[PDB]
Symmetry: D2
């Protein structure tokens, strides 16, 4: 038929960068395998703990595994930690004390941080009530970091510097590890004291290093994203320097507990095995992302990133230029998704945002954005984020089905 | 029962005499077990709980009807408006932290009036360790107001110690290892109404561990603004593998919840996974499972008394929690006993306990604990400081049989 | 009501005092026995460890299977989540021993409907004795509920591989059979035909006497786990215990020839089965001390009940005579609403597949069909006898039936 | 890797050689996965099908429907895919027995089946509930020396009593190629002609989703497998499936649970989501392992040793083998494999006695699920010419990395 011959062409087009992703996967897989080897993980580690959850070799060892791979000295990846926003809250509060300041050097971070930093809700337990400053240095009009403004913002009370890797809904390239390495070296030059924290959601195992490999003191994410293999039903993670993880430990739970208690329950296997599959599962979403870009190019739509552009995370978006074209697409996806095909997506009023958005996401786990989900704010020139993919076959079948429907 | 074991034939006649003695208090414990059991049933009716409530959620944990509702059921029975009982709170000591921090801000003072709080509040209030995210580094004040020499609340000292900075008042219900009576709801209704007068602002917080479903009313019934505990304890029915509840006034709970999770997130997230049945069900059985452990304290109280040891509380004494101790007066007798209790349990009976050095305490201690869960102290257990006159805390029990059988087995094994 | 009711229940209890301590005696003696056996196999929380895939070498399971054995007076023990129901155990147990050319001889009379299907006297022989060339005969009881030892001993010819004996009464108007009653039974047939394998469907019977069928000479015995032994705490399963070469014969019907008892992933269900077993005596005790009350509080209210409160117990069955349709129905309704879960899910007269009469069924239960919990049910027909049996705690059973009597008066 | 500058250009050449075979395994990946998606779309599956059921396992719309999806996608009317079946071996004996009655005969036409089926017929089992005690006969038409089915022998060995035809897709240790959906089509067609009365059953293990069809798409009456293998995605922790015609599965249902009950009962507990998501993932997971075999063949052959099937050989299943031709090499490599596995890598294995085998076998299984052969496992008996099985793998990489490491690890 009509569609076949062009997807025949796009795949023949992107072979170069596709073959390449397979590499960083192999690499990423290899490293993972060596940590498992080095830590001699046995099914003995899949053993559940109850009550207080003291003496959980599985938990303690999974934490030292992640931390190994993520390039860090210490790891705190437990089911307790409910998500990746909870993690960053933890990381943030775990380190900030009255009279301090967090300095975000990437500009306004994703919405939810607003609320943590008490600039949204009137302080529900925020920095605002713990007298903890917060500053969001904007980006160059060109999308780089305002190193001038950053240098000027830093001072004695700047306890902590923030960096968000993936762009999200923000209008700028998702920051590379290399761009992140330059970053910490800059600020640390001005004040070696500061702890540098990076929010590493969406960026895991899509490059061959994570921010800790290059001088970050803490980072975090969600397991319902990349490092999860699409198998971990919840949780987050915090890996970094032994002493700053300590404080994330006491913060999460309580003084007198730190990171020694909290039962595993039946959660420990799916995390190991998700992490083993992670580099490859993330691989699948990336080779999908890039095909999405290569495909909607030909069909005649501004895609971003462009397919032949480097990638530091799983963000990808296309401009349909037409409202009715967007919505049909995002519905095509929700119908091509595995679970909940039948719950077709319509325009929803978005709290905060004076526009309506459409949210396509038919995923095995609630909000596991490692799985295929399309969505975007209803407004010109009609950009809908279409990312995720547990298997390349899925992403390929999905957006093939998305063009069938609306073509 | 089955005294057809070993020496236990001189024993048989005495238990047969004891049980006939404590029939009075057993009847009445059975009653509040009814009472309490009944409140639980009618609350379940009001919230129309179904197996639709046992439904697992995953991912972010939004829209968890089973979770939210368990929450408003714990609150309903513990006499509060809002609650927070979920796996996230990983224990009893977590909840109390959460509780305190969830409400305390820089400039404030916590005021404990029930005297020195059990060991591990030290670390929280940051007078033990340090740099551990304690009150120390948050400028949050704290004071343990000591009790009377008679083990009452020094009411004069309490008033003397409450200034406008006092944001939060502390009340520990269970005596623990403290040489003082476990304060009663009555003692606690007069307690909070006192400070409430001096400072109608103070937020009264009670620590309700071991006390749950052993009077016909909990702290939130009598004015407290916040209480908590562990689920591997009473309200768990010996069935819940872990947790920690917080119950109290809509908005104090709220602030706790944001402390658990994060600002903006609040309480409305965090997946259930598979934990929701054992909790509904631990709760429904609870008032009974504690009932069995409470009658246990009474049987050990009457029995050891006869055999010639100071027990505490005495069998005929009134009861607000499950604590119980016997004065063996001898090191080798105490240890043989605690060991026999470890051997009388269902799991690990064979890991026999010995004296091990207690960090912080200048004495060794011994610990019996053969529990179906790790550290669930609703189950039979025993320990104590190895120091004259050799008091060992023998408390807990899933079934009255088990307690009975158990401390009998110990006396039999005290044939040496 | 409520102040007209209380003096009566205070006077029910004050009368049932002695029978209550007796029900306790046997709890202590049964709970003490489970302790010893636990004590014996050094069981630990390392016996709860989950197993997946093939479930090869599962110390956790196998040892649980031993325990169940030593406690029921049998050699081996086969008890696993795979056994999805009591019916399955018995199906597994019967088929596992019976071979083409053999006959089963139930002597405790017409077994409950479900065996009607497995043997193929009812259902269209969907894998029934009929299809495997196996005969089945039940000897009808005496007019007074005893066993017809004459019709028994004349029906045991050379083709009688197996004896069948149902302990609990079911909906049958004959008393449940006691551990002594059944000991007489097997001694009888083993004399006539030492070959016969004697089997006992022990459902509802576990931990209500200080012994079980296999303690008095039975070759094999099966039941549900979401009932008595599971302590209300386990979520699925079923047990067959008995002699070495019968259980392992069982093993080959459940899994498959060559697997035996070596395979099967426990997964997540170990701890509940152990702990259930440990609470089981005390829990099965609450439904017994609950039943007798049902019998002595309902008697005092001028309604025939059975067994009598002072009647010696062997299982958990308790029935009460309402004598009026609306009365009976209202009561069971009142039970459903007095239950921990699904109290709003009020039940009525339904049609029931394979019963000339409607049935009313109250089932406020945490576990689907765990007949260890308080349930009220029975066939809506004169003289309107309902079964009010089960109850996870004495209180529950007291509070509910008290509430039942309430909705009757108003 | 230490010795990895002679290997990198070689595996780089293995790949550039197998380029087309891979794309072709992708084709049927896409084609298989689209089909699973379709059938989900059809039963409108939701996160409410994931819901646990305890006790009698009644009113369990999650289980039963999950069966229909399996059936649909496998081209059968009905399915009995539930945890109550503990493995493939059980799926097969539940199904064999679920249909065979006294006086009946089983005629396996693909020659001698894999060991464990012996223990079920009473050929080794000492008659422990085997066909023998129910007066059921069993026979196997031994293949031609050419590896094909001896049709002349088949047609004579079918008499009025032959209730059931047995066909085994995968090869196991049988020195004969695993048969294809096509080879199998001709098979059922023959026998249905000779006796339209026969019920033809296919032990389908290791084949599911490796072709664009399955046995009941080409006229099979009934097929079994294990869930911890292909169809389970590598993600399901226990199970097994029977799929096929209405009145066989239902019959099968009655052998499994009980007469009178059928498929009505059986508590799911906490297992629905993994079986569902295992199924959506399966087509792709099986691909990573098939893309592995192809490779292992095209890499080990270049290194001199016989591989079988050949890398370019058309595929019907996941079984792969490599002739090492020296005992030591065969051991070291299987050890090399074990260590390259995610879990149990320090659990180094050797030649030890094997119950039921005149030889010792060495088994490297660093799997997550105990015996789930969908994960990379190396194993094989120690005897000339020392052919080993280096098969399975959750991801192509794992597979590449591992054997690459094993070559390094010795050569």
């Amino acid at each position: 038929e009509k569609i076949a011959p062009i997807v025949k062409e796009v795949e023949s087009q992107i072979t170069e960068v596709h073959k390449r992703a397979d590499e960083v996967i192999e690499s990423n897989q290899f490293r993972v395998l060596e940590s498992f080897g080095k830590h001699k993980i046995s099914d003995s580690h899949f053993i559940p703990t109850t009550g207080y959850g003291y003496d959980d070799i599985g938990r303690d060892t999974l934490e030292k595994v992640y931390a190994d791979v993520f390039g860090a000295e210490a790891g705190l990846v437990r089911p307790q930690i409910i998500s990746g926003t909870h993690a960053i809250s933890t990381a943030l509060f775990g380190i900030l004390r009255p009279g301090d300041e967090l300095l975000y050097i990437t500009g306004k971070p994703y919405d939810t941080l607003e609320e943590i930093v008490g600039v949204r809700g009137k302080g529900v337990g925020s920095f605002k009530e713990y007298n903890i400053g917060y500053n969001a240095v904007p980006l160059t009009e060109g999308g780089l970091v305002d190193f001038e403004a950053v240098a000027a913002a830093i001072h004695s009370n700047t306890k902590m510097i923030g960096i968000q890797r993936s762009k999200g809904y923000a209008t700028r390239p998702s920051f590379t590890i290399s761009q992140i390495k330059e970053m910490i070296a800059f600020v640390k030059e001005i004040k070696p004291d500061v702890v540098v924290f990076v929010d590493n959601c969406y960026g895991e195992f899509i490059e061959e290093q994570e921010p800790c490999h290059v001088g970050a003191d803490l980072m975090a994410g969600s397991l319902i994203k990349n490092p999860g293999g699409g198998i971990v039903k919840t949780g987050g993670y915090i890996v970094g320097k032994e002493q700053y993880v300590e404080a994330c430990a006491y913060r999460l739970t309580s003084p007198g507990i730190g990171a020694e208690a909290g039962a595993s329950l039946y959660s420990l296997q799916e995390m190991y095995q998700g992490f083993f599959l992670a580099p490859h599962v993330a691989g699948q979403a990336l080779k999908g992302a890039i095909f999405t870009a290569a495909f909607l190019e030909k069909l005649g739509m501004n895609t971003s990133p462009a397919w032949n552009a480097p990638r530091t995370d799983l963000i990808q978006s296309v401009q349909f230029d037409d409202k009715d074209r967007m919505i049909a697409f995002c519905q095509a996806i929700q119908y091509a998704s595995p679970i909940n095909s039948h719950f077709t997506p319509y325009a929803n009023y978005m709290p905060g945002y004076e526009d309506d958005v459409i949210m396509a996401a038919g995923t095995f786990i609630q909000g596991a954005s490692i799985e295929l989900s399309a969505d975007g704010p209803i407004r010109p020139p009609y950009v809908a984020y279409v990312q995720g993919g547990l298997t390349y076959s899925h992403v390929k079948i999905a957006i093939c089905s998305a063009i069938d429907e609306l073509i």
